[PDB]
Amino acid sequence: AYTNSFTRGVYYPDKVFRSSVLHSTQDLFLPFFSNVTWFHVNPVLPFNDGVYFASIEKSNIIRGWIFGTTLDSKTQSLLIVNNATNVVIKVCEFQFCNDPFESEFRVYSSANNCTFEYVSQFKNLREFVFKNIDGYFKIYSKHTPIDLPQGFSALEPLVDLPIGINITRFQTLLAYYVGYLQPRTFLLKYNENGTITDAVDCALDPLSETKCTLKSFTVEKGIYQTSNFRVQPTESIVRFPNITNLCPFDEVFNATRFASVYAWNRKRISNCVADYSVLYNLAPFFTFKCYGVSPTKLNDLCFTNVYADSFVIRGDEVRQIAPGQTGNIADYNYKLPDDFTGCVIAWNSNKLDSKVSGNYNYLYRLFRKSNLKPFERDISTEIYQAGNKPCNGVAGFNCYFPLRSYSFRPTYGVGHQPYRVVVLSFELLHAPATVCGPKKSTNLVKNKCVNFNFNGLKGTGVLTESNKKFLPFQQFGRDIADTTDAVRDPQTLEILDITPCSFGGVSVITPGTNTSNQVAVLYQGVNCTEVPVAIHADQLTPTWRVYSTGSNVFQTRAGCLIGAEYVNNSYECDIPIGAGICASYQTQSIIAYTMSLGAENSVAYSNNSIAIPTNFTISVTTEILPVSMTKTSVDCTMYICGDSTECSNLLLQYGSFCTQLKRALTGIAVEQDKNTQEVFAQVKQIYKTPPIKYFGGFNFSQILPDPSKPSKRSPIEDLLFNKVTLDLICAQKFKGLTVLPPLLTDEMIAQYTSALLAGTITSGWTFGAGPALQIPFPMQMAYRFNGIGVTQNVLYENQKLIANQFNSAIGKIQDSLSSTPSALGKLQDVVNHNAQALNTLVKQLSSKFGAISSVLNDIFSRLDPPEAEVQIDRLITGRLQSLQTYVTQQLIRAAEIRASANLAATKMSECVLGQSKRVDFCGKGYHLMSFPQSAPHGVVFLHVTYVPAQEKNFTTAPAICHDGKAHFPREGVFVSNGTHWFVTQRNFYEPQIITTDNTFVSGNCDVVIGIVNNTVY
Amino acid sequence: AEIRASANLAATKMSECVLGQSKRVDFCGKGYHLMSFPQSAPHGVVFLHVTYVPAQEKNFTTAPAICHDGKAHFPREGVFVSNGTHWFVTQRNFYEPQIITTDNTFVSGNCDVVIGIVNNTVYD
Amino acid sequence: LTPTWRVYSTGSNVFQTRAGCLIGAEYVNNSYECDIPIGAGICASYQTQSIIAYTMSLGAENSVAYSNNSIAIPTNFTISVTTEIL
Amino acid sequence: NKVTLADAGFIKQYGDLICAQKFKGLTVLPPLLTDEMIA
Amino acid sequence: PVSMTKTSVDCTMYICGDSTECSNLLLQYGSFCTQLKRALTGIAVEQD
């Protein structure tokens, strides 16, 4: 039968204790919700990559297993039996009987050579995990007092056996379930007492991939870039030249007599198959040193200009056959270019060249005027002159013959014994190739993703017939990036274009893990006709699938959306997809739609119709502005090195990096206090509110300091300081990352805010321009109504209604902040950004950066200084880069916060210390006044504005013709109830009788279009 | 980027403080801005801001409106203040008491709504 | 002691602050304008003769005589000329 | 018609400089608001 | 100007194009690609 494995088979991947962490592990796991085979009480199930084995029973019916390859005597098989006394393990040549199954003698007949033996110690669930890696048979296990259960439980290591055999099949020695392992990435959640309490299978589905991307088990609503889909190569091809003759290496290496180093011999190698394995049969212990390549890779490459230079030298000069070496041999005999690509093969040839008597067939130049250029040969015998004399003639004093013989003898020490040297020079500068290693050519697959190899150029992509034409000397084409984009096929000589395999970005639209587990997927920049759908795991690198269902596939200019039904109704954007398309959870399913820009409203325009408001609303709105960020300090050496003195000494050689970082962070830290001072320290005097808090009916209790509180904060300020969350700090501290306190405490900032509020309440805007002049609050409001163009009588006649509207509006602010979650989101964003940056810095200390380990002490305690310093250099470079990135991001964030703080200071000056006429600067409507409230890292402004309401249509005229004079309203607009004509102020309907004092006259009523006949009393 | 923000601010101040008179509070100095003068400085600009600062304040009694002949009067371009026994209308930022006439105030309704209205003669 | 040198803790010249331990300054109870900022509201200055730590002063307290019928009006003015450097 | 865009971030159908960038892993995403909605 | 081009980078494709050994090595340089992606996503959201 078959059943669902659920979330079972997780096993502790390491022996390290961990607590309150989310750790990511790549290992052989049992994929979640896997189809496991259920057997009941059996056959010989295969061993694919490791096995999860479960056994629900209460009678020890299951006793062991037999892992092996043929399970016969012709091979070696592992045997594991659980006898009531012990457990027996035996890798040994077993002729297992056909139905093994208490008489243990009924399992196998013969037990030939045994290379490994070992002995050790409500139904029940015995879970096991068997793996075979690097010759080790690992077993993890767990017992649970109990269709597999549907809970989470993790398996602990039991034993690793060095059994040294391949295991392809196994059989249970007699309900047991058998699942299989695959290479997977898992996100494991460790408990506080170090217990794995949950896992996420990253490759299970798109939501799991989102969870692993965010390193969390809960995903908020939104759209997340999770990974990129990548089409995988279907097959592989190899295209090498058709040449089959072997290279003439025997006539080079196996030569009766080699040349002299001064007249060294050069041989051209072409049109042949170069099998370098034929080497390694030279005078044993020979030197085979390569430059630009590795000896083990020569058989896999193709070469352009292969030359074999052969000569004989003395052993102690073999070190001189290398780039940049100096000496008689390297200066006057045989020089190699500094940029030499090739291989030097040297081997002692005492038994070929040495002569008991002295061999004079091998000479070397000892004296030359100048040095030689690379690969140059000098075969002249002129007399070298070390003296100023006209040496022209024969040898003598300061006149030496330039060549001297080695005189190799069998009795010499190794250092002066003959060595035969062969230098192979080749250009791996691709180019058309004639010498190639032994490699078989497959067929050419076009218009299909493949792994390809053209004369050693390896790659993956799609090959198409090219319209480009190469010149005879050209074999590859290159693009702007200098990557090969065209290749001439070595056999047919046609030109093929190389294109990358289809790939793209994938985004996951989630309504929120809380709300639902449904997801939609956006394949970005792709049309649905091209969305990968390959069934087998050969495509869509994510490796999960979101199959179509008809109405669940939509095409947007941002890409193809799968899993969201498109609707024709328009809404506000909930989750932005792009190109006008948004998505949301209907409730039940995810729906995509075109976003609405808002509701239409045709304004009734006429040449004589005017709408005048008849009422108003006092609106109180909120504006939240960051003012400062956490001041941070970094102990550079403690972060980079951390208790390692060797690392500190090595660090000293890297420059003034830490001084620069400290200076930049100090600049940011000082700027934060400057920001706070510029926002809140505007007042010179700490004004205090009057003990008797009557203000004409206006109630400031929610904004004024509350004397009960130990901090003397207002109720709204307390709500703000509780809504913004401001052991991880200790972990950061241990790495040298510290937070510096702000200069102004929250009590001092609240005191500044209180002084500002008292000044504005008791004196209006006068305390911002000089001495604070007291004025009754209703009179101040009358001034602020005169500011927005409303006559004073409006306030005094509506004092109680205005006061009540203000009080109710101020009352709703507490709810509005506390209710809407993402209200303080800007200040919380500042806090979260700092915390995230520091946590990222701490987490970067576990990165190896290509070194063998991220622990400096382990590197120093296991390596000699020469190589240790290389590894430590990798680590120090990586950590320095982490610090530099952190400081640069901090500088950019501090610039942005400084802009926000300059804006907050401007708002403090122009909305709290005065009444602003700038539209939308201090709230939506017509600004009346504003109140500041401190917030953990910023300032909240409560803007009080006047909003017209209950508008009424009237008929209007540009002017009034009376007595023959044209009349225009001095401080208002002409309106008509329908039959009578009044003059009204603009923002409040207050009709008045048209007199010659509320009106002025200019010209006759013959030029003013629209002029109307009436009487100006 | 920081210096460019500073130079944008300096250009704005050159436009609104030197080429005009600014109503924005504290944009062109502390006090009510009258005018400003630019002076070039080595790598920047210096603005000499000339502002009007009120001084030598005196307390007065004040009322929202004045009741006369059963009519409520609100000041046109001033506030009502009292020497102690008589009543004047003054401009806000400088003590310039004037006899309350029916030319520097306006009538709006009766003296039965304003919370604080005071009886006195509005000379016609 | 990594910095080797040590400043003697004479008792009256050791103080605890949220910024850390201050040694070589005497905490007083007067409030002056901040001269050298230590942090968390604490500043330092040369008294004259020794270094003193103190809680910084936000400014001189003031109380505006608010009533529901009293208005302060300036009788005079000053023409001020301030400087702004950009 | 006076400002020339380079990519504009719209669907590319498999089969110049944009192609080079895309093959190297660099893409342009479309703005949320279209030109018509901004208009 | 109001907005600029929104850009996305496939870090693995740029650094390790079509090489798998390079990708498995790149898995050891920490969260660099994740930080780059987060920064560019922040820019892209800021444009809208």
Ligand SMILES: *[C@@H]1O[C@H](CO)[C@@H](O)[C@H](O)[C@H]1NC(C)=O
């Ligand atoms: C972890 O184990 C400890 C053992 O002392 C126990 O006290 C604690 O409650 C456990 N944690 C849980 C149950 O979350």
Ligand SMILES: *[C@@H]1O[C@H](CO)[C@@H](O)[C@H](O)[C@H]1NC(C)=O
């Ligand atoms: C040299 O000769 C030996 C013996 O015939 C042979 O095994 C070897 O491969 C030859 N070396 C080369 C480089 O051909």
Ligand SMILES: *[C@@H]1O[C@H](CO)[C@@H](O)[C@H](O)[C@H]1NC(C)=O
């Ligand atoms: C995607 O490909 C199909 C098939 O060629 C085509 O009809 C469609 O227009 C393409 N998508 C876009 C956005 O052009």
Ligand SMILES: *[C@@H]1O[C@H](CO)[C@@H](O)[C@H](O)[C@H]1NC(C)=O
């Ligand atoms: C006044 O408005 C109406 C309707 O919009 C229009 O027909 C008429 O021409 C306008 N007046 C004049 C003088 O055009």
Ligand SMILES: *[C@@H]1O[C@H](CO)[C@@H](O)[C@H](O)[C@H]1NC(C)=O
């Ligand atoms: C103005 O609005 C208020 C509600 O805030 C209402 O009580 C009052 O009656 C309205 N005034 C008029 C004249 O409708």
Ligand SMILES: *[C@@H]1O[C@H](CO)[C@@H](O)[C@H](O)[C@H]1NC(C)=O
């Ligand atoms: C002012 O408002 C607070 C909170 O809404 C309330 O408790 C208090 O009684 C109010 N004061 C007056 C004088 O109405």
Ligand SMILES: *[C@@H]1O[C@H](CO)[C@@H](O)[C@H](O)[C@H]1NC(C)=O
């Ligand atoms: C003004 O008139 C238009 C059309 O005549 C009407 O739709 C609108 O509701 C009116 N507005 C008011 C405030 O009466």
Ligand SMILES: *[C@@H]1O[C@H](CO)[C@@H](O)[C@H](O)[C@H]1NC(C)=O
């Ligand atoms: C004219 O305005 C008066 C208010 O002053 C109003 O009582 C009257 O109804 C208006 N005329 C018409 C025709 O509505």
Ligand SMILES: *[C@@H]1O[C@H](CO)[C@@H](O)[C@H](O)[C@H]1NC(C)=O
């Ligand atoms: C307004 O009165 C004047 C006075 O003679 C007259 O000429 C004009 O035609 C009148 N206009 C209308 C629209 O009645």
Ligand SMILES: *[C@@H]1O[C@H](CO)[C@@H](O)[C@H](O)[C@H]1NC(C)=O
């Ligand atoms: C205004 O009255 C208050 C309270 O009596 C007083 O302290 C203040 O000095 C007075 N103002 C002037 C300018 O005399």
Ligand SMILES: *[C@@H]1O[C@H](CO)[C@@H](O)[C@H](O)[C@H]1NC(C)=O
């Ligand atoms: C009242 O004003 C009058 C001027 O009309 C003058 O007696 C003096 O300034 C004030 N009187 C008192 C007692 O303040």
Ligand SMILES: *[C@@H]1O[C@H](CO)[C@@H](O)[C@H](O)[C@H]1NC(C)=O
């Ligand atoms: C002003 O005069 C009216 C009319 O007699 C009276 O009702 C009112 O009380 C007077 N005001 C004061 C403050 O005495």
Ligand SMILES: *[C@@H]1O[C@H](CO)[C@@H](O)[C@H](O)[C@H]1NC(C)=O
């Ligand atoms: C006006 O102020 C006085 C003194 O400050 C106070 O006794 C009175 O209650 C206030 N007005 C009202 C209506 O309470």
Ligand SMILES: *[C@@H]1O[C@H](CO)[C@@H](O)[C@H](O)[C@H]1NC(C)=O
């Ligand atoms: C106003 O102040 C000036 C000094 O700035 C002084 O000379 C003058 O007498 C003052 N005027 C009054 C009326 O106090």
